Design a protein around this ligand. Structure first.
Ligand SMILES: *CCC(=O)N1C[C@H](COc2nc(Nc3cnn(C)c3)nc3[nH]ccc23)[C@@H](C(F)(F)F)C1
Length: 280
């Protein structure tokens, strides 16, 4: 995987797929010059660093090559910064489970957990801390295949850095580990906490975590030992894995490599671990 540098004439926006603080994402078409191939893409236009700085960051981001991480295919530097990324046809996993909750069986749910863990482990191998993992930021290539994406909170750790110490950026409190909330510390093990919350979202078919609790109250609730409840479809074996992801000591929590193994085992006999009517 290498970074293509794109001219404005090489791609065209087709429609909006979403937007936020980072900017706006469009569905579009990439026609590499002279190549006679139309490639469906998602174009992320951001809302200034020197071009050389932006490119160097884009080069690193484009080297991230894993089946379960959405890849940066190219970049166009004009008045605005535009990132050309793989288009995920089915949108975010959060919307997908909400929509299709009547037709989602244990096999798909457990496979998604495996895939997200595989992607996160790859990021860890690259020393990348995601810092914003949630079902809304997992995208669907096909119902059978999902990819983690990133809208700018991810950080690369230095050779000797074991943690990221954040500044004042706004934070998704209900997905964050307690040490991130209290001390702005982020590690792969804090990503594991967020992973556990993401899995809870899937197992409840897109339900809201800590529903009707103010974000400002979350740290105190977690300090008292309260955690998200066991989803109706979850056997205790699955729930206990989620609970391990939310232990106060980051090194108590499993590693993504260990989560891959445990969920892969469960995905081999899925009806044993998730209880879903009509499944199958
Ligand atoms: C649950 C969160 C959510 O839906 N979004 C939408 C966008 C995602 O931006 C991207 N979308 C897609 N594909 C897609 C979107 N909608 N459909 C029907 C398909 N592929 C992408 N590849 C990279 C980025 C993509 C973000 C938001 F709104 F923040 F921009 C979260």
């Amino acid at each position: 995987a290498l970074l293509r540098i794109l001219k404005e004439t090489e791609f065209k926006k087709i429609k909006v797929l979403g937007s936020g603080a980072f900017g706006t994402v469009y569905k579009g078409l990439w026609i590499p010059e002279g190549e006679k191939v139309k490639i469906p893409v998602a174009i992320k236009e951001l809302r200034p660093k020197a071009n050389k700085e932006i490119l160097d960051e884009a080069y690193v981001m484009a080297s991230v090559d894993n089946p379960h991480v959405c890849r940066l295919l190219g970049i166009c530097l004009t008045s605005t910064v535009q990132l050309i990324m793989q288009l995920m046809p089915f949108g975010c996993l959060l919307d997908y489970v909400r929509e299709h909750k009547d037709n989602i069986g244990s096999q798909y749910l457990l496979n998604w957990c495996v895939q997200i863990a595989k992607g996160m482990n790859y990021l860890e191998d690259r020393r990348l801390v995601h810092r914003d993992l949630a079902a809304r930021n997992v995208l669907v290539k096909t119902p059978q295949h999902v990819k983690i994406t990133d809208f700018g909170r991810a950080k690369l750790l230095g050779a000797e850095e074991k943690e990221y110490h954040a500044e004042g950026g706004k934070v998704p409190i209900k997905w964050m580990a307690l040490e991130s909330i209290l001390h702005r510390i982020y590690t792969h093990q804090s990503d594991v906490w967020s992973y556990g919350v993401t899995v809870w979202e899937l197992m409840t078919f897109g339900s809201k975590p800590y529903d009707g609790i103010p974000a400002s109250e979350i740290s105190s609730i977690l300090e008292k030992g309260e955690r998200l409840p066991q989803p109706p479809i979850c056997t205790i074996d699955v729930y206990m894995i989620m609970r391990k992801c939310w232990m106060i000591d980051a090194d108590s929590r499993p590693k993504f490599r260990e989560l891959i193994i445990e969920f892969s085992k469960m995905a081999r006999d899925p009806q044993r671990y998730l209880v879903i009517q009509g499944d199958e």
